[PDB]
Structures are given as structure tokens and as C-alpha cells.
Amino acid sequence: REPRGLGPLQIWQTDFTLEPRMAPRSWLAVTVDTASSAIVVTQHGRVTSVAAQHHWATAIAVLGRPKAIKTDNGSCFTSKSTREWLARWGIAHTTGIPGNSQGQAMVERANRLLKDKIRVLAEGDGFMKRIPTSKQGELLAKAMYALNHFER
Amino acid sequence: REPRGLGPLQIWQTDFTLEPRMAPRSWLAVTVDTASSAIVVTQHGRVTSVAAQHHWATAIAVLGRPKAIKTDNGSCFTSKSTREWLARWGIAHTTGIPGNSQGQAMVERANRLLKDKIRVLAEGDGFMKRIPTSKQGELLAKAMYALNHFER
DSSP states (O other): OOOSTTOOOOEEEEEEEEOGGGTTSOEEEEEEETTTOOEEEEEESSOOHHHHHHHHHHHHHHHOOOSEEEOOSOHHHHSHHHHHHHHHHTOEEEOOSSSOSOOOHHHHHHHHHHHHHHHHHHHHTTOSSSOOHHHHHHHHHHHHHHHHOOOO | OOOSTTOOOOEEEEEEEEOGGGTTSOEEEEEEETTTOOEEEEEESSOOHHHHHHHHHHHHHHHOOOSEEEOOSOHHHHSHHHHHHHHHHTOEEEOOSSSOSOOOHHHHHHHHHHHHHHHHHHHHTTOSSSOOHHHHHHHHHHHHHHHHOOOO
């Protein structure tokens, strides 16, 4: 229930964003923890309900189980499969207000910081276009570290 | 748990705003239901923990019990009394991120629409300064109706 004392509620925003620098697994599933601004990102060869559940499994290992997750109305998020996986985990789910305007501005911003940092780290290593496959995992983890941890 | 299907989470934002047109009970306690934008406002002679609980009792009769309520760090919201009253009701409570910037922008906007509508309805009835005490309850309920219900 409580958000840990008066602290922010454990609510996540999750989305998928396409990043060809990461092909063939160019579908990046990104979660932003709304209380701490922490971000979890994983790569996927296809945008599907199952890819979203593999991504939430990893985000759950990294940040803990949330009380609720916010997403858009994508089929990979409203499928019977995905609802059931979130029901199995005890996580509430919302797609927001029908005509929400857009409510998930934090995940959108996360999407943009990530593509920019990926581009900057990749160009730093000489990769001006698609990152060679064997170099992608450590570069993506490097971009996730860069936006999460500030030695400060 | 679930927000009713994929609908918005039952989360409220509550605050107090001072309105001398309503003296002596010039302290308006306002709650905005974040999923529907509905607003509940009650008047109070003083800003205290108890006034906030009387206001939530009324908001609960009008909108139902919420899963969580967001407020600032006012003493009337972090007192042992208020925490206990919310714990008695099973409602989670958050004051947000310490240095949240300000997270409760919806209640702030609600505060402004309300003072403006109160001023407009009062000037419409010839009351250019404090509203006579005996006319306040129906004018405040009138401003709450005006911002909640659109015959559309």
C-alpha cells in the first residue's frame, strides 16, 4: 500500500521505441521508475506481448516489483497474455485516460535520452551507423549506466 | 489493485487554499480525482489535520474510497493523526519526491479554477468582496457543480 513512508508510489511507465542502431534486436523496451527516475532498457528482435513480459521480468529483478505499471494501448500491452502475466505478478495496470492526451511523458523523455546517449557512445567508438552485433549488449548497458548512476 | 480494466488509477491530489471571499471559513480544502478531473471542495475555519480528515470524509462520500492520496508536506498532512486516519481507511499516502519540484500540478490548477469561478459567481450576485456568510454554502456548491458537470 503505502509508498514507503510518504515517499513516491512504486509506479512505472513502460514503452517500446525502435532503434535501428541496435538491429537486428532494434526494439528497445524501456521502463522508467516514476519515483526515482531510474530506467531499465532491454533489446528485442520483435515488438510482442512476450517481449514486454521478458522486459518486465528483468525490470522486476533490477528495481523490485512495482504496484502499478502505466503503458499505452499497444496490443503487446493489452493482450490477454500480458494482462494475465501482470495479474500473475500482482501488478496493477493502466493504459490511462481514453484520450489521455498522452500521460506517459516520463517514459517518452527516457526514450529520447536513451537514443541520444546510444548515438553518442556509438559514435565515440567509431560506429556511425548500426552498431556491430557483438558490441551492442555492453553499449546498451553502458547507456543504461550513464543515465542511471551519477557519482554524485 | 487494478484501476478498473485499464482505466486510470484511483489517485487523488489534495491541498488547502486560502480564500477570503469565504471568511470566516476561508480555508478551502480541495481534492482533485486524477483519473476523472472531478473536484471536491469544502470550507474550513482553520487549516488543521482534523479539517483535512473531515474534507476526505466528504470526498470519500462523493467519489468513493481512493487507493492513494497525494499531498504536500504540510503538518496537517504529515501529522500522526492524519497518517492514522488514512491508515484506518486503507488509503496509501504520498508527499512525493523530496524536492518533487512540485508534483501536484492538477490540484494547483483546481485551486485556480475554483477561486476564479467563486469570484465570477460572487460578482454575478453583487458580492464584490466577502460573500455574506449565509450565501456561502450554496455559492461554493455552485462553483463545484460548475467545474464538475458539463451538460455534454
